[PDB]
Design an enzyme around this catalytic site. Sequence first.
Site, PDB file in Angstrom:
ATOM      1  N   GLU A 186     -11.110   6.708   4.912  1.00  0.00           N
ATOM      2  CA  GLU A 186     -10.225   6.240   5.957  1.00  0.00           C
ATOM      3  C   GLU A 186      -9.820   7.327   6.989  1.00  0.00           C
ATOM      4  O   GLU A 186     -10.290   7.384   8.135  1.00  0.00           O
ATOM      5  CB  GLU A 186      -9.010   5.619   5.166  1.00  0.00           C
ATOM      6  CG  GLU A 186      -8.499   6.409   3.898  1.00  0.00           C
ATOM      7  CD  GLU A 186      -8.226   5.635   2.576  1.00  0.00           C
ATOM      8  OE1 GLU A 186      -7.161   4.968   2.544  1.00  0.00           O
ATOM      9  OE2 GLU A 186      -8.982   5.745   1.514  1.00  0.00           O
ATOM     10  N   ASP A 221       0.832  -1.185   0.000  1.00  0.00           N
ATOM     11  CA  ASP A 221       0.000   0.000   0.000  1.00  0.00           C
ATOM     12  C   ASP A 221       0.896   1.276   0.000  1.00  0.00           C
ATOM     13  O   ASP A 221       2.155   1.224   0.027  1.00  0.00           O
ATOM     14  CB  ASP A 221      -0.994  -0.087   1.195  1.00  0.00           C
ATOM     15  CG  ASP A 221      -2.261   0.739   0.979  1.00  0.00           C
ATOM     16  OD1 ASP A 221      -2.314   1.532   0.066  1.00  0.00           O
ATOM     17  OD2 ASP A 221      -3.266   0.528   1.663  1.00  0.00           O
TER      18      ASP A 221
HETATM   19  C1  LIG Z   1      -2.619  11.709   1.528  1.00  0.00           C
HETATM   20  O1  LIG Z   1      -3.112  10.376   1.615  1.00  0.00           O
HETATM   21  C2  LIG Z   1      -3.661   9.808   0.392  1.00  0.00           C
HETATM   22  O2  LIG Z   1      -3.963   8.451   0.623  1.00  0.00           O
HETATM   23  C3  LIG Z   1      -4.719   7.819  -0.445  1.00  0.00           C
HETATM   24  C4  LIG Z   1      -5.210   6.463   0.051  1.00  0.00           C
HETATM   25  S1  LIG Z   1      -3.895   5.469   0.703  1.00  0.00           S
HETATM   26  C5  LIG Z   1      -3.926   3.999  -0.271  1.00  0.00           C
HETATM   27  O3  LIG Z   1      -3.752   4.453  -1.601  1.00  0.00           O
HETATM   28  C6  LIG Z   1      -3.630   3.445  -2.557  1.00  0.00           C
HETATM   29  C7  LIG Z   1      -3.206   4.083  -3.904  1.00  0.00           C
HETATM   30  O4  LIG Z   1      -4.092   5.169  -4.295  1.00  0.00           O
HETATM   31  C8  LIG Z   1      -5.012   2.712  -2.583  1.00  0.00           C
HETATM   32  O5  LIG Z   1      -5.037   1.757  -3.621  1.00  0.00           O
HETATM   33  C9  LIG Z   1      -5.294   2.064  -1.213  1.00  0.00           C
HETATM   34  O6  LIG Z   1      -6.616   1.500  -1.237  1.00  0.00           O
HETATM   35  C10 LIG Z   1      -5.166   3.103  -0.115  1.00  0.00           C
HETATM   36  O7  LIG Z   1      -5.099   2.499   1.164  1.00  0.00           O
HETATM   37  C11 LIG Z   1      -3.862   7.813  -1.724  1.00  0.00           C
HETATM   38  O8  LIG Z   1      -4.516   7.361  -2.905  1.00  0.00           O
HETATM   39  C12 LIG Z   1      -3.317   9.200  -2.011  1.00  0.00           C
HETATM   40  O9  LIG Z   1      -2.335   9.072  -3.027  1.00  0.00           O
HETATM   41  C13 LIG Z   1      -2.700   9.830  -0.788  1.00  0.00           C
HETATM   42  O10 LIG Z   1      -2.466  11.201  -1.094  1.00  0.00           O
END
Ligand SMILES: CO[C@@H]1O[C@H](CS[C@@H]2O[C@H](CO)[C@@H](O)[C@H](O)[C@H]2O)[C@@H](O)[C@H](O)[C@H]1O
Length: 606
Positions: free
Chosen positions: A495, A289
């Site tokens: 989240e 992740d």
């Molecule tokens: C600033 O925090 C933001 O977090 C999100 C979600 S975290 C993580 O991201 C992965 C890739 O997008 C997802 O596939 C997974 O389900 C999530 O747990 C992130 O997308 C942002 O890039 C980030 O800025």
Amino acid sequence: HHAADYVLYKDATKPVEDRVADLLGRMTLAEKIGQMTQIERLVATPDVLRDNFIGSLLSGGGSVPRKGATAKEWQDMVDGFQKACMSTRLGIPMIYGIDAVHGQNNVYGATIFPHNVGLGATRDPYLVKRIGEATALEVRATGIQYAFAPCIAVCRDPRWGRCYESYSEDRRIVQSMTELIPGLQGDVPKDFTSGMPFVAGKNKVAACAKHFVGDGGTVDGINENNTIINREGLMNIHMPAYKNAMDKGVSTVMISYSSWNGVKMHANQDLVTGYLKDTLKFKGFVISDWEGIDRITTPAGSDYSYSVKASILAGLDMIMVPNKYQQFISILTGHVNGGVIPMSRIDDAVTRILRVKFTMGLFENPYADPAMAEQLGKQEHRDLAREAARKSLVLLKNGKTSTDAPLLPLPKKAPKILVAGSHADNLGYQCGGWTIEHQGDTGRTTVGTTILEAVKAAVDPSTVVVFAENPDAEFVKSGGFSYAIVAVGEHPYTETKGDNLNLTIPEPGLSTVQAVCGGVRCATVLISGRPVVVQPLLAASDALVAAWLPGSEGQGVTDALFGDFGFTGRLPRTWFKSVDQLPMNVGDAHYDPLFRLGYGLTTNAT
Ligand SMILES: CO[C@@H]1O[C@H](CS[C@@H]2O[C@H](CO)[C@@H](O)[C@H](O)[C@H]2O)[C@@H](O)[C@H](O)[C@H]1O
């Protein structure tokens, strides 16, 4: 094969495993580590991609070439990055991933399907398959080949801010909805081996079952926290849909931020290598992740050397860095150079990455297809989303007493009607999280039809439709309304901030329903990512519909309100009486639900 400069891995007629081995045996350590590195488009440039032999890029939530970009702008961005990757010595194409979790949802004009909780309400796996198919087409429209979906979390406490990303608290429903996978990727062959990755070709995308494992079981539904439960409950609640995913050839698996009985999943060799790889025989690639390996330590990021060692030794193949690629590469290089990480582990990670790329046809079609651009927002896809939204709605009440005339379905012809509430004309709210932005947004953020627009598109031309977002009681009593449709509910979240202990909808919401319903018979459309405190809304309303987060096609709501179709959705989650009861799941200890899992009233089409 008959040409002097022949290179086996570049021959499309050869078996995947031979191409994989042929390429692997040519690669330098830098080339191998580069395959294991995924970076944000935000930090990518042609030079960075070439010089560091980068394997993958992503867009995280909200990471777009610009606001409002067309399908072709996205294709040109991806192709631009691909051109740099294809210019390396070996010409290994990158894979580009994105969260297309309810349609191609970061993209302006993409069809936005109901979130997973709503799809759980449909109990219709074939519908979800077709949504995978249409989602893959809209992803490919933007040149992207990889979708970080499905989220097969089994959310066991609706206080989790990602509960809407879980099809159900019941693993059997989640299992049934892994049909998204062959939608996204294509149906696997007759004789397919469970665990092998599969993508049919350039009109499909690689999928990702996420987040391994127990992400929906976290304590107090706290995002990324600890999931405390014995091997028997992990294996019987949180694990089984992974096996369904193996059986349907899911190409990748993303690891959870969460821990299982205090062990970080991103460091868990026993579950990642011992179970997913060596027991389920998963042969695709395992991706971290976002800064997941950073989060192995407390504080996060405080021993990145350790993070890289722990994760790569646990069995992860590709790291979603996503920013500090130079530090990641440097650290992993040093670990291999000093014998801390053996070449056998690198070679395994790279084998898997290449196996997925070659299988999916990436070496044969590394570039976007411009004729696919027009798939974005295709009306056939919107019709499908509208069908899904309609089938997702669960009718919770239709009449205050057992003797009242049923309010729904409403007549399309009436002299004057009222549409009201914070959520009646707000596309962003009806889409929720992971729409345009990571956290969603408010207002007209993409192309769609709000509930008010849907009402106006449905009613007889003699029917006067009045909109007021938050009318007072006098306004309603004086209006000469036949009935009202009032829509209220939760704001968009994820989240980080969806984690909520009270689960009561923001005001004005209840106060508006009370003012409207105290003046005229009312159908209350509740927009939420989950069950929320609902007794006061119920007491005020003639009818009440849980619409979840139905996406861009608000006509799916009116299709049911006005009786073009009957209500058929059934709760995919337990509806609690109080948050003090939680966690409380079907089958539990002292199960005392307001509405049990499976509840839903029906209507007949008029
Ligand atoms: C600033 O925090 C933001 O977090 C999100 C979600 S975290 C993580 O991201 C992965 C890739 O997008 C997802 O596939 C997974 O389900 C999530 O747990 C992130 O997308 C942002 O890039 C980030 O800025």
